[PDB]
């Protein structure tokens, strides 16, 4: 009867329980996307000031008229912004990301909301994370 | 339970609260119209002097017999005046504006009030602003 | 609350206070009529000299026997006189005026007072001014 | 901690700041009363002409002896005048108004000032506006 | 409305009422002529004494046989007399005057009345005054 | 002793920890209600303009006099507005919702605040969310 | 939405309404001219007395034969008069003014009216005020 | 702009137009002098009767030989006469007046005209009125 | 700050400047009295002719021996005359007036001046006008 | 970020904009002074009548010889007049006011203009208003 | 190794994360204070009308001369107002609150700003909220 | 030698190795306590909502205002909750258990943490398990 | 799997969301600038009175001729004014600020608008706030 | 063959399986660090209030201006805070710990993030836990 505990090692000890690791990066990394949306927020306000008086988008470019210069959540490899765009090239492990957040602005039209553009080229599941954060849809 | 705050970012953080920006230009720009009515006022007085003695409208043309030369609130692209008319071509972002403020004058008749004429060709909502400032109606 | 001052411009600033201009011309122009009665006065005296010795009206015609030649208050377009008549054709803005001031003279009769005749054909309110100056009534 | 911003919407977002709207109509409408006093003014002058020579009030009735016919500030529903009275029935939203501005005239007496009479039957606060414009008191 | 009183100064205050001054000198100066006829009167009497006995005109010359010496109403610049003549050179402002009052005398003929002669060379209206005083006609 | 870890799977591994999911929809969905109150806000302003001059509610109906046309937070199945009402039929998963936000307006009265009306017919807990957002009470 | 009231301060609060101040001095100062014509009036009468008997203009000089000495409306810097002239050097803020009111007198001619002469050297708009008061034209 | 009418009250309403009052008394009072010359006239006739037969001046004293007793124009404070003298002490407001109208009479000499003597001690301008009425010169 | 102009209407616009109208009738009506004295004048002359030869007053009654029949300045309601009396019943607005101008005549006495009698029964201020025209005193 | 709107209430909502209220009373109250000058005007005319014939100031006292009795603009607490003086004790909120408008009259002197005397004892800024209305200076 | 997850429940699961609840009431309740300042605002305007004409504070008491009656943000237990005071007894959970907002008014002084008075007796931290809203300082 | 294996059965085969069974129930049952703390957790959240707005504990009672009704891990014999209390009577084999989790709430105080109360009456070793799970200490 | 929540603390809990604080001071401080423009406003009016009569700028200096003495919004460290200048040295945290608001005045020129001068030496972004409030441009 | 089971006890029974205990303390203790970061969080908020208005760090010190007093997760031996610092001396078994969390604040600079400082002096592996929780890096 003593042999059975060795057999449970042959199988039962190998429960192989594990968090699905690729799913795990999907979640915290998605948080990096969402935290990036938080990085987008101050830009939403300063761009509203560009809407407020400057009369056009070049004033809306980051790094000017008091707009904050774009900058990384530390895990991210890179970022850039102009006209309020957040083409986050170099995002996290997220190669090829670029939320081409084209501004919706033209004041006589009344247009305003930024045009989101998912662009996570490195993997489609990551795109499931963008639709779940920076929706590819253009209303903001 | 920790996932819910990420979900509030999926929706609640996007309150998307905003002043309706096109409505916003309608209000300050309407103020540019009304400030223009203030620009019209000194002309109403000098034109009354034209009524006072000159005996006819050419004397009422701006830039003469002491009448002030017409000039822009600084946002406005352009203006012109003659016979007391304030055809504000080039108004603000208000393309096509021209308050054809034809004078009502002929002294034997006793006629006096200027003939307002809304002419904001660029958008009808802007016309709601003219009716709300320079009424299209002719009594003044 | 800030919107209300713009609303007072929508209405209260347009007090549209004004002197009734046609009434205004009625008053100063009536003064031109009355000043014309003053122009009539020297003629009343020289015509009395015609009564004084000449024995008839042709001597009473203006421009003769020392009578002054008829002449305009400067605003007036025209005038004429004969037998002491002051048919002020061309008066002021007063088209059609003619105070047919026919002399009342014939000395054996004892008649003397000039026959006033309102004749402001251009407007009836102007006639209210003549009754208020050169009364249509004939005693003088 | 994220829940608090939703709570500020439960209360703080409902600042419910507002101009007291009924007070607002009290002010611009009071301006309609005061503008009406301006409408009364030309009548004060023509009635002075009635005092000037006609010798009695029927001549003072509006629409005659050159007096202007009574007429509305455009918001007003109605008006009427006789003997210089300004019983503004139909005023603005001001139902029941009638400033029974009875003339004070009788020249041998030396009496002149018009007898004001507040009569804003539709609401007492409106009467506060009449005392603040057309005082119920009779001196003018 | 306040501007109108300034306008009445623009016109009504300039009533420009005035006595016609040249006519005024015509009247008092004519009185100087007539007063001169009064100066002529004592001479008419003393000349009648010359008719009375002396038998001819040299006795009629002024300043002799008790005749008064000729002399000025004080305004007059000069005078002279001989044979009863009153050639009033230097009269008043009346330059060139000379009533060549030639005597009509020759007693066998029965002739008597002085020959008046208007001679107011300075202006014809003054001559209207002489015909109205010292008639150019010769009967006296 | 080896058997115990299998027993912990019989019970302890089934911690069955979970966010209470129906409570979870209550929270984000409540946010959809509150975001809807944000959708109500621009309408509160344009309706104030209807209060501003139009003089009555038909002008207050959405889609007119510059009022925005009603429209969905994207999760919502449907919406409608008239006289400023926000009867959000089709809200979210919120079947039967209709905030019958009847306007409180009549300016002579001074009345203004919108009449809220909870109407989440699909479940009473959802009504706890309406009282917690669009209170059934009528002050706004 | 709170930012808009700050924006109305950026523009609407700067209505910059103002009476045109240079026009304002034109009006009250013109009144100083007209009041000066009133100062001229007593001189018109005493000069008529100079016409009345003295026989020439030196008697017409101010400060003599009972004529009032010339003197300032208090705002005026200076004045002078001779032969009835009103060369108002130093008028008000009106540098260079001098109404060279040369008398029209010579009694044998019948001439009388004073020769007005606008001379407001400091600015041409002021000359518009002289033509509107002391007309440059010579009849009075 | 409303402030300007208050400013016209600050200056323009104070036209301070006025008849020069001291000049006014000069004119009517001068008329009292001239009316006094009319009072002198009947005395000129009765004194001529004194010349007519009495042979000397005591008979010429007023109040005798049918001469009228001296008496006041009612405004005058006092009067007296003797030998035809009209020393009008107490004249009008004319303190110190006394026209010492000494008679020129002595019949063998042929002398006749009364010796006028201006004596208006109260003011020299009044003396301008005496030279203009009772000339200080002695011919009458 | 905008409210102040409305306040100036509450008070400053009501300057209530006016000629004192009852004083105004006092002046022109007094002129009607004085013009009536002018009407009295021809009667003074014809009555002097009655003094001239007729030997008594019935001849002095108006309407006879060439005396003019009495008649109204047109504003006057009525008049009558006898023995030179001017009891102007019905004068102007001057009810009760009657200048009982009784003649002073009786030639052996030397009496002549008419006996004035103020009798303006309608108001005492009017009597101030009679003392200022037809003095109640009897000398003329 | 939500906290900032509460902070703007901590400061920006307290714009504390206000008309400077004490300055406001200075302006309308100054108008009460100026309206008082208008009350002074009829008195200027009746006092001119006192100058016209009465010969001295007691006749100039108000309430007599037809002068109007003194009376309040309704806001004023009190007034009095004698010899044409307008010592407006009790003026408005203007405690201690008294324009001791002593008449300048004595006709032999030719003096006429009333002696103004600012006397607003309650505050010096009010005195700035008197110098700006009833100047302390004595010419009128 | 399996025991460790139970140990994390012994400690790590008890993160005890929480919003500091008493701080939470401090914030929304402070908003109730600030919303109360908004309730104070309409009263600031009507009290300015009390400043506008009534002349004293009793007219400034709430519930009169058109002032709104005081009333609760619904969470508040009670309120009262007089002379513009906002002694908010019963505020929220804020026992003992009373912003004794004594008016600063006395118009001759020019004083205006309301005297704030923090009075949150229930806790000092609440007083930190009053200094952060209704500052204890008196300028408004 | 063969007898020895029988002897090892006399002793060695009776190794009597065993998990200490009472210790075993201590561990899994302790897990039932800890799982119960997990059952407590949703209640911690809903009670926080009771803290969120209801203002007191009755709203905090389970089974109300959306709070979950209390319920058993299946091994447990019974449970109950009120005011957030988790007096788990009938726990597991744990007779007498009752974690009298009295809420720490009173918001003005800022108090919040639940008052734990070990109450495993059936055995003290079980109490070692409560101190190791639901600590008797009151902070939560 | 339990380790992941600790990892979210390693990153996700550090959302580091924050209002950009330096931007925050830019906004409320800009409000201090704009509130300062409100402080400038009463000075704009009193300086207009300096334009009104004083004739030059020294009268325009603050603290005189009734102008308010300059004073701080309480956060400001310092201020000064002369000739209407608002060189706000010591503004807020705004070191080096000085809006050298030189007056545009010289009345014969018609010049009026104040010369703004941004001078926020402490930081250029603050200058963006001045251009957004007190524009460096000189028209006002 | 029976001997082998005794031999498995000689080796196989000594599996010596064990969680690496020092690693175990590293994990739960790291949780004590992370829970400490949670303790840091309320301080992050109150310090943001210090940023909010106080203007400097002393107000940011814990235990003041409403900041919570610092306090231990119960395992910790000690803690302290000032200027927002969390120098956790006495942490857990973590001797020498002190996260010198120096605040990053100076508002004109815009600086904000707290300066983390790992300081786990007792062991370097513990420092691996600080880098994994309170990173030595200074951004927060």
Automatic annotation (TrEMBL), chains A, B, C, D, E, F, G, H, I, J, K, L, M, N:
Signal peptide: none annotated. Disulfide bonds join 50-60, 118-130. Keywords: Methylation. It comes from the Bacteria. It holds the Pfam family N_methyl. PROSITE patterns: PROKAR_NTER_METHYL (PS00409). It is found in: Membrane. GO terms for cellular component: membrane; type IV pilus. GO terms for biological process: type IV pilus-dependent motility. It is a single-pass membrane protein. InterPro entries: N_methyl_site, Pilin-like. SUPFAM superfamilies: Pili subunits. Belongs to the N-Me-Phe pilin family. PANTHER family: GENERAL SECRETION PATHWAY PROTEIN G, PREPILIN PEPTIDASE-DEPENDENT PROTEIN D. This is Prepilin peptidase-dependent pilin. It comes from Escherichia coli O157:H7. The gene is ppdD.
